[PDB]
Amino acid sequence: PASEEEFQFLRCQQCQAEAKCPKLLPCLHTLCSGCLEASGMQCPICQAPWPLGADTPALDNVFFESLQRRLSVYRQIVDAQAVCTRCKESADFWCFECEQLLCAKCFEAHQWFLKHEARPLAELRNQSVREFLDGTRKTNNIFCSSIYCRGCSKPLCCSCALLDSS
């Protein structure tokens, strides 16, 4: 399994992320990428350590999709698509062209902001970089209501400067 090694690089749990440690975050402190996953980013409930189940490997909660959006921010600035890593990731059935979201409402929000960051099927198959460059230059949009952040719920080029910690 060639592309299977892409996540074995970190033994990721049904997710994909190239950076083992973000140099900055909207949360309190920079730590191992799994630290904010081991315990919810902003969830004060006893479910924050996901004793009942984690959302990123399988949809569990809307607030725990904050982790999904956190990973999706990095995948938006530069996309380490899990589909190329794992074409079986299409089991979600690809409701929309943007990755690292679920329940169709984060997708609908990316649409509301006309800020899809769509990874087309041609991009999912990893055969081109022209569309990648297009999406990259589009990372800085000129419309609103640059890339989404749930805390403020608005496009922000890098909410790391905000330190939202919603």
Residues 32-71 that bind a copy of itself (CB under 8 A): none
The one-character DSSP state at 4 is: T
Amino acid symbol at 17: A
Q: Does the annotation flag 46 for ligand binding?
A: yes
Residue 96, CA distances (Å) to 6, 113, 117 in order = 23, 15, 10
Q: Does the annotation flag 152 for ligand binding?
A: no
Can residue 19 be called a binding residue for a copy of itself (CB under 8 A)? yes
Can residue 8 be called a binding residue for a copy of itself (CB under 8 A)? no
State the Cα–Cα distance between residues 75 and 149, nearest whole angstrom.
Answer: 13
Among residues 23, 44, 52, 93, the one that binds a copy of itself under rule CB under 8 A: 23
Among residues 30, 47, 102, 136, the one that binds a copy of itself under rule CB under 8 A: 136
Among residues 36, 82, 84, 98, the one that binds a copy of itself under rule CB under 8 A: 84
Can residue 133 be called a binding residue for a copy of itself (CB under 8 A)? yes
Can residue 21 be called a binding residue for a copy of itself (CB under 8 A)? no
Residue 71, CA distances (Å) to 80, 130, 143, 148 in order = 10, 23, 23, 12
State the Cα–Cα distance between residues 157 and 21, nearest whole angstrom.
Answer: 19
Among residues 130, 142, 143, 145, the one that binds a copy of itself under rule CB under 8 A: 130
